[PDB]
Amino acid sequence: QPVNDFIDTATRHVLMRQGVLGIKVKIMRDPAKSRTGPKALPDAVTIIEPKEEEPILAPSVKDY
Amino acid sequence: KKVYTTPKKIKHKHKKVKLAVLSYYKVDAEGKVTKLRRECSNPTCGAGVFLANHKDRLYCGKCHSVYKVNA
RNA sequence: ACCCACUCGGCACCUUACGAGAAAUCAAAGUCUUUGGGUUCUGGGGGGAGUAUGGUCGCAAGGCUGAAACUUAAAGGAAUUGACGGAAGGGCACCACCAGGAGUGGAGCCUGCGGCUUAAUUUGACUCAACACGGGGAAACUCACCAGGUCCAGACACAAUAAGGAUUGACAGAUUGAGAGCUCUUUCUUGAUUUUGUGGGUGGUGGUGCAUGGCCGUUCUUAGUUGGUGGAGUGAUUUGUCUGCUUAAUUGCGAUAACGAACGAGACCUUAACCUACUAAAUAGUGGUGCUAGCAUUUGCUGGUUAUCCACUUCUUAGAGGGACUAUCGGUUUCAAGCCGAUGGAAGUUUGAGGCAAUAACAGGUCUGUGAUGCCCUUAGACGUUCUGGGCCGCACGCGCGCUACACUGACGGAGCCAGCGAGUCUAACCUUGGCCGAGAGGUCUUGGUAAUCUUGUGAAACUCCGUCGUGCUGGGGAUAGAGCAUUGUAAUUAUUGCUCUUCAACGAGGAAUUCCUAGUAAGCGCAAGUCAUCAGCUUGCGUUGAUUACGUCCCUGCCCUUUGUACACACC
Ligand SMILES: [Mg+2]
Ligand SMILES: [Mg+2]
Ligand SMILES: [Mg+2]
Ligand SMILES: [Mg+2]
Ligand SMILES: [Mg+2]
Ligand SMILES: [Mg+2]
Ligand SMILES: [Mg+2]
Ligand SMILES: [Mg+2]
Ligand SMILES: [Mg+2]
Ligand SMILES: [Mg+2]
Ligand SMILES: [Mg+2]
Ligand SMILES: [Mg+2]
Ligand SMILES: [Mg+2]
Ligand SMILES: [Mg+2]
Ligand SMILES: [Mg+2]
Ligand SMILES: [Mg+2]
Ligand SMILES: [Mg+2]
Ligand SMILES: [Mg+2]
Ligand SMILES: [Mg+2]
Ligand SMILES: [Mg+2]
Ligand SMILES: [Mg+2]
Ligand SMILES: [Mg+2]
Ligand SMILES: [Mg+2]
Ligand SMILES: [Mg+2]
Ligand SMILES: [Mg+2]
Ligand SMILES: [Mg+2]
Ligand SMILES: [Mg+2]
Ligand SMILES: [Zn+2]
């Protein structure tokens, strides 16, 4: 499917003196910018990256 | 393929003859003019066009054929 | 005799390589542009050619010595990637087999291909990957074929003719298949729109698919493709991408000079499954209520009622979510990837089925889908086009996809009576309910429907029930044929289709062969759509009834992947 969402195809027969050649062009647009669609490949599995912890600090509690 | 045959006799076309036509018209000695060939009584051809003369036949050609006035 | 250490001198092998090489490799092929221990011998692009000539040896065959003219841009070496092999090793699959199913092969006809036949019987395609294929079910059309008849719809430029008419049309007759003025007789008409000539265009289902685009089939029911940084190699290149194990998968685990990635596979998308959870609906349905019928009466039971109202969303529809991740546990396994089993589960075979699908290859098919196209052919007695009729169906026969059967798990007659995917009429005649008439096919009057609204609950067929038939080519079977009635269409003869009566063949389960298939599958069974004015024994889908047998293998066949040989690279055509 991502085909459908992302790559643009076209054929165009250019008709020269000798014979005729076909032109086939294929453009793959950045899934990042996709605007109104899926924003990425169904392959795309990002991990969000944790955070250094400075733990311990024996119990205690604050009041308000 | 095959090319050519024929029992001869190839067809022609048409000629439209020649003539110097509209002498058909007679004006007496200065200069009263009398029309030969009676004209046409169909309002599509206001009496300018003429009837040809065959047998029975008096025929408006301007009418590409139409109508048979016989006198 | 044997063991252990040593040492000369032998035949070798091993690993390394400071080193050497164009490499393969080499303790010499090392100590060579940092070029000299001594010495012998041979070579100087290939072919001509170890030829000719001489000499010399020999019994001989022949040996040693040994040229040139001419010809020619490569011959050649080692290694690399490929492609191929009638080598070797591993795998993968019901277009392979195993265990079986249903058959095809035999018959009748249907249908395509050949062949013959023909005025023509238009043509493409010929192993899988030509032959119910070109959506190819051709009565006209289509249509290209044949027998003939018209028309230019021959742009444009020049020239020529020519307003004393360049050209156009035609009534009747003749003529013609024809109410074509095609042509001719006759003689009006038209008015510079044509005509004629040359150049130049134009059309063509004419050629070329071995000139092309595009598409498509095949390889492929396959698992392959590449780059970053690192290791090797002067180098093209390799390693990564691999013994093994696992998987449908270069799917993974694992081993590991590799590490870590991308295309492709997967993911993804579509459809069939599950939601008493969510938003709802007189174009979907349920319960209650009235209005109401029938039967029973003691409350009951069975229907009627596009709105007489109330409510609801289980069933139907489709939005949004959820759900499965092979989960739990257990066996098995390098206790790795996995695999197998049990419970749970709508679902646990890639969940079932599809859609998409990398790099490359083929002289695969398609110029006959295209106003996609090169070049060739042809272009007015046309290979343009249209009109009339015939033809593609022609029948001693070979082949292929099918259809209907040989019956008693059946035919026939009643009777029960149940699906799902579809499709339907505007500037129109599509889907058809209902009422009559008709044995039937059909007709005729009306009617709803541009459709979740009407056809339609598509009351489909197999199938289930009670009968008749009773193994007899029988009431199985319905080929072939006659006579009549009807529908489509301008047209039905060579019989479009449908009905009625009659006629009642072959075929008693099919030789060698050979196809398809693993679950709601196979097989049986009908329906809708495509085609379509009329015609399905075809196809695309659909649903109904619903098995036996695998859950393995490499034996046959087919194809991958290594290894390997290569003098092939236009690559074994
Ligand atoms: Mg070296
Ligand atoms: Mg070599
Ligand atoms: Mg078998
Ligand atoms: Mg058999
Ligand atoms: Mg015709
Ligand atoms: Mg010309
Ligand atoms: Mg010319
Ligand atoms: Mg054409
Ligand atoms: Mg080709
Ligand atoms: Mg092609
Ligand atoms: Mg050809
Ligand atoms: Mg299979
Ligand atoms: Mg290097
Ligand atoms: Mg490899
Ligand atoms: Mg519901
Ligand atoms: Mg269970
Ligand atoms: Mg060819
Ligand atoms: Mg084409
Ligand atoms: Mg045919
Ligand atoms: Mg076929
Ligand atoms: Mg019956
Ligand atoms: Mg009657
Ligand atoms: Mg009988
Ligand atoms: Mg019968
Ligand atoms: Mg039909
Ligand atoms: Mg067909
Ligand atoms: Mg090689
Ligand atoms: Zn007149």
The ordered H/E elements of chain A are HEE
Q: Report strand order across the widest sheet of chain B.
A: 1-2
Helix content of chain A: under 10%
Number of helices of chain B: 0
Can you count the beta strands of chain B? 4
Using the CA coordinates, give the radius of gyration of chain B. 20 Å
Give the overall shape of chain B: elongated
Gross morphology of chain A is rod-shaped
Characterize the biggest β-sheet of chain B.
2 strands, antiparallel
Termini Cα gap of chain B: 59 Å
Strand residue content of chain A? 25-35%
Q: Which sequence of strands runs across the widest sheet of chain A?
A: 1-2
Class derived from helix and strand content of chain B: mainly beta
PDB class: ribosome
Keywords: 60S, 80S, eukaryote, RNA-protein complex, antibiotic
Entry title: Crystal structure of Verrucarin bound to the yeast 80S ribosome
Chain A: 40S ribosomal protein S3
Structure description:
- This is part of a larger assembly, with chains A (64 residues) and B (71 residues).
- With 64 residues, chain A is mostly beta strands.
- Chain A has one helix and two strands; from the N terminus they run αββ.
- The longest helix of chain A has 5 residues, at 2-6.
- The N and C termini of chain A lie far apart (55 Å).
- Chain B is an all-beta fold and 71 residues long.
- Helices cover 0% and strands 14% of the residues of chain B.
- Chain B has no helices and four strands.
- Chain B has strands spanning 26-27, 33-34, 51-53, 58-60.
- The chains hardly touch.
- The structure holds magnesium ion (27 copies) and zinc ion.
- Chain B binds one RNA strand of 573 nucleotides through strand 3.
